[PDB]
Design a protein around this motif. Structure first.
Motif, PDB file in Angstrom:
ATOM      1  N   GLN A   1      -4.015   0.766 -10.504  1.00 37.79           N
ATOM      2  CA  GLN A   1      -3.315   1.881  -9.857  1.00 37.79           C
ATOM      3  C   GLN A   1      -4.124   2.452  -8.689  1.00 37.79           C
ATOM      4  O   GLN A   1      -3.558   2.786  -7.639  1.00 37.79           O
ATOM      5  N   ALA A   2      -5.440   2.554  -8.851  1.00 38.70           N
ATOM      6  CA  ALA A   2      -6.275   3.134  -7.805  1.00 38.70           C
ATOM      7  C   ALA A   2      -6.292   2.217  -6.591  1.00 38.70           C
ATOM      8  O   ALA A   2      -6.361   2.679  -5.457  1.00 38.70           O
ATOM      9  N   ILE A   3      -6.238   0.909  -6.828  1.00 42.03           N
ATOM     10  CA  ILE A   3      -6.190  -0.032  -5.701  1.00 42.03           C
ATOM     11  C   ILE A   3      -4.855   0.093  -4.940  1.00 42.03           C
ATOM     12  O   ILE A   3      -4.840   0.138  -3.699  1.00 42.03           O
ATOM     13  N   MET A   4      -3.739   0.211  -5.655  1.00 39.74           N
ATOM     14  CA  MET A   4      -2.459   0.346  -4.971  1.00 39.74           C
ATOM     15  C   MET A   4      -2.370   1.698  -4.245  1.00 39.74           C
ATOM     16  O   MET A   4      -1.717   1.812  -3.221  1.00 39.74           O
ATOM     17  N   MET A   5      -3.064   2.716  -4.748  1.00 43.72           N
ATOM     18  CA  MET A   5      -3.141   3.984  -4.026  1.00 43.72           C
ATOM     19  C   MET A   5      -3.946   3.897  -2.722  1.00 43.72           C
ATOM     20  O   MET A   5      -3.778   4.733  -1.848  1.00 43.72           O
ATOM     21  N   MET A   6      -4.794   2.882  -2.575  1.00 43.58           N
ATOM     22  CA  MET A   6      -5.434   2.622  -1.287  1.00 43.58           C
ATOM     23  C   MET A   6      -4.377   2.245  -0.253  1.00 43.58           C
ATOM     24  O   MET A   6      -4.502   2.564   0.938  1.00 43.58           O
ATOM     25  N   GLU A   7      -3.336   1.554  -0.713  1.00 45.22           N
ATOM     26  CA  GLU A   7      -2.222   1.210   0.160  1.00 45.22           C
ATOM     27  C   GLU A   7      -1.447   2.455   0.600  1.00 45.22           C
ATOM     28  O   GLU A   7      -1.098   2.611   1.781  1.00 45.22           O
ATOM     29  N   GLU A   8      -1.164   3.327  -0.358  1.00 43.30           N
ATOM     30  CA  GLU A   8      -0.441   4.565  -0.070  1.00 43.30           C
ATOM     31  C   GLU A   8      -1.234   5.432   0.892  1.00 43.30           C
ATOM     32  O   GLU A   8      -0.671   6.053   1.799  1.00 43.30           O
ATOM     33  N   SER A   9      -2.548   5.467   0.698  1.00 41.71           N
ATOM     34  CA  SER A   9      -3.428   6.286   1.530  1.00 41.71           C
ATOM     35  C   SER A   9      -3.411   5.827   2.992  1.00 41.71           C
ATOM     36  O   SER A   9      -3.322   6.643   3.909  1.00 41.71           O
ATOM     37  N   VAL A  10      -3.492   4.520   3.215  1.00 42.55           N
ATOM     38  CA  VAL A  10      -3.484   4.019   4.584  1.00 42.55           C
ATOM     39  C   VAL A  10      -2.162   4.320   5.283  1.00 42.55           C
ATOM     40  O   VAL A  10      -2.142   4.632   6.467  1.00 42.55           O
TER      41      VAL A  10
END
Length: 150
Positions: free
Chosen positions: A129-138
């Motif tokens: 989940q934290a890795i996919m939130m890197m996508e949301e953040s960018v």
């Protein structure tokens, strides 16, 4: 690749460990990686475990290497002793090159192993989940840029 290492550095930064971790050089004495492994499994990589990792290193690259071999052995041992589903460790980082030369390509391989621990450990859904939130953040950065251009 050195570019992969830079990308995995941004992933390391999602852990918010205590030691600074902005550059490749910040990772060469092994302290940051040890602290990240503690976040991943604090029951295995605990305060006692972390004791083997010398902090006052400076430019003692022989000591860096010593630290890094303990971390690499730690990763291999965790994979063998704890993890049901083994990680992908066919090719190991040459930590001698990390310690002596701040070799980004080798450091990238080590970070891949650590990410392997994160996405195979008991808490893997958290780390995925934290890795996919890197996508949301960018995307927030990109949307901000677009709005500053409109």
């Amino acid at each position: 690749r050195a570019e992969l290492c830079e990308s995995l550095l941004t992933w390391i930064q999602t852990f918010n460990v205590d030691a600074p971790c902005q550059t490749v050089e910040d990772l060469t004495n092994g302290v940051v990686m040890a602290q990240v492994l503690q976040k991943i499994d604090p029951a295995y990589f605990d305060e006692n475990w972390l004791n083997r990792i010398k902090t006052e290193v400076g430019d003692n690259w022989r000591l860096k290497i010593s630290n890094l071999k303990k971390i690499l052995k730690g990763i291999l041992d965790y994979n063998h002793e704890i993890l049901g589903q083994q990680i992908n460790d066919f090719t190991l980082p040459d930590v001698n090159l990390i310690g002596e030369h701040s070799d980004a390509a080798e450091l990238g391989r080590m970070l891949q192993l650590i990410l392997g621990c994160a996405v195979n450990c008991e808490q893997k859904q958290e780390y995925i989940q934290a890795i996919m939130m890197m996508e949301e953040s960018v995307q927030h950065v990109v949307m901000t840029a677009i709005q500053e251009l409109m």
